[PDB]
């Protein structure tokens, strides 16, 4: 059930069968989080999960898309993700369409863009790490020394993190590798979103929309405290459907809220099977 970065959540028959749902991992998690959604989809709906790969969002899609095509040929494609996973599903939809494939459904499970753009500037890096340092001070009750802004503002997100980690390790702090790697990859995967070069998509997108981001997302990036009515997708997607689901972002992937997603999604899938 594991093949490279592809997890089989429910296998498709040797030949024929219903259209698979492809799900994409959230930052800091695997596609096992889609098991509740799977329970609320029609019986025998196949489901395959795409796990983490490296690079910009575009570079990640460039590794996913050939695999998608190896598995599902010309389509139809049903692409679904929560959080980062929604952004990844979209980037794959864009890629698949350029190659002429048939993309029938893109499900964004509260993959809501920050309500203001995140500036890609040296000033914002300075401000960001000033905030992070102030939070570190209250939490671990230490006094943080002068941040070396000159070094930090010249680095990309992965460079910034590597620098801060090296400083932390230098400072004498010993942290178990699993915790570091989980924190580091979650952080960088969520930051990857900020520079996703988002393209218009000519098909149907469903955005399942919670009420708000949870506090930790806002502490990660304060601009997530604001949401636009189209979740930031309205300019790029002509055929955008929004389905309000309530709750917080972190609740959207679980029961009971996931039942509302699965019920609507089940109807979309049903229509796809009829149109076959």
Residue numbers in the entry: 1451 to 1726
What does the paper say about this structure?
Two laboratory-derived mutant strains resistant to TAM1 were found to harbor non-synonymous mutations, i.e., either D1607N or D1644G, both located in the TE domain of Pks13. The crystal structure of the D1607N mutant explained its more subtle effect on binding, through the loss of ion pair interaction between the carboxylate of Asp1607 on helix α6 and the guanidinium of Arg1641 (3 Å) located on the parallel helix, α7. Without this interaction, α7 shifts away from the substrate-binding groove by about 3 Å, moving Asp1644 out of hydrogen-bonding distance from the P4 OH of TAM1.
In Mtb, Pks13 performs the final assembly step of mycolic acid synthesis, i.e., the Claisen-type condensation of a C26 α-alkyl branch and C40–60 meromycolate precursors (Portevin et al., 2004). It is comprised of five domains, including two acyl carrier protein domains, a β-ketoacyl-synthase, an acyltransferase, and a C-terminal thioesterase (TE) domain, that together contain all of the activities required for the condensation of two long-chain fatty acids. The overall structure of Pks13-TE consists of a core domain and a lid domain. The Pks13-TE active-site pocket is formed at the interface between the lid and core domains.
